[PDB]
Enzyme design. Structure first.
Site: not given
Length: 330
Positions: A35, A199
């Protein structure tokens, strides 16, 4: 040193991925959920409330000659899906894919929430976010990667998750045969303890690319792709009959639909998520309503590039003094 381990989807939907991990001496092999959005290595154990164990493999520290109670240490964690676990702490030897750390904090669960009990395939979590998020008190503990870093050939790990197929976690090296083209690296902020990056935009299907900054986290422990409501609405508007359902808890679409791809930007590069990857199947057995793999982050507080996005890429988690993320197509 290096390590290399295969990671395997737990079910036919790629809801999560499990990776075998050797703990203790002699080794006890548990299948953990790696994770990158959390920083605790915790396991089902001989200390877990018996009624909360249902089929998981447990770690028994009393059977490990290298286990040592970390005196006074406790841990307690809550995840973004509302699940939680807590317990005490041992140090022990932990190996992943041939890479060994001695003195790793292994957080033994005394209690786990129902969703963990109900998933017999996941024996615990191995956190790979920054150690500042580790929940051990009163002395915060380091992640497996943090402990291994100095010994690794290069201070990196990579995630190569499969679509409906196994994939690979590598530590200490970048397998140049595992991706196509080049790796585009992008800046990371560690201010929130995550692999947080920005992004450069998105496209829906064959549509034009929208240049827009989307700050979010690279999180292998989250199944889906959670993005701003504007972006998610633009995606699902291209699927006839798709709608957001408050009762189901997100966007659903007719199972008869063919889903468009979704592209996200990494600098000037582009990662394409095929439409198929966005299908999470019937909302209940036999239903013709299917659950979408791109959902709104509006109720989370952060955008999450979960498995839906990451499995479309070869992803480098560069833990150099100034961390960065790399993405390549594959």
């Amino acid at each position: 040193s290096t390590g290399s381990a295969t990671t395997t989807p737990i079910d036919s939907l790629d809801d999560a991925y499990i990776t075998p991990v050797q703990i203790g001496t002699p080794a006890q092999t548990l299948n953990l959920d790696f994770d990158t959005g959390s920083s605790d290595l915790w396991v089902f154990s001989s200390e877990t409330t018996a009624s909360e164990v249902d089929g998981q493999t447990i770690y028994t520290p009393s059977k490990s000659t290298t286990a040592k109670l970390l005196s006074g240490a406790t841990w307690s964690i809550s995840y973004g899906d509302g699940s939680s676990s807590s317990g005490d702490v041992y140090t022990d030897t932990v190996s992943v894919g041939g890479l060994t750390v001695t003195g790793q904090a292994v957080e033994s669960a005394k209690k786990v929430s129902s969703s963990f009990t109900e998933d017999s395939t996941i024996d615990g979590l191995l956190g790979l976010a920054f150690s500042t998020l580790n929940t051990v008190s009163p002395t915060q503990q380091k992640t497996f990667f943090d402990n291994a870093k100095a010994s690794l050939d290069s201070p990196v790990f990579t995630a190569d998750l499969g679509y409906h197929a196994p994939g690979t976690y590598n530590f200490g090296f970048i397998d140049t045969t595992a991706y196509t083209g080049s790796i585009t690296y992008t800046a990371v902020s560690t201010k929130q303890g995550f692999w947080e990056w920005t992004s450069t935009g998105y496209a829906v299907g064959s549509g034009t690319f929208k240049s827009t900054s989307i700050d979010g986290i690279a999180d292998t422990g989250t199944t889906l792709l959670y993005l701003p409501a504007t972006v998610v609405s633009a995606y699902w508007a291209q699927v006839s009959g798709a709608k957001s359902s408050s009762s189901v808890g997100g966007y659903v679409f007719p199972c008869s639909a063919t889903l468009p791809s979704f592209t996200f930007g990494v600098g000037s590069a582009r990662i394409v998520i095929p439409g198929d990857y966005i299908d999470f199947g019937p909302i209940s057995t036999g239903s013709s309503s299917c659950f979408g793999g791109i959902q709104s982050s509006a109720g989370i507080g952060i955008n999450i590039f979960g498995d839906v996005a990451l499995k479309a890429a070869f992803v480098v988690f560069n833990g150099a003094t100034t961390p960065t993320l790399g993405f390549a197509s594959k």
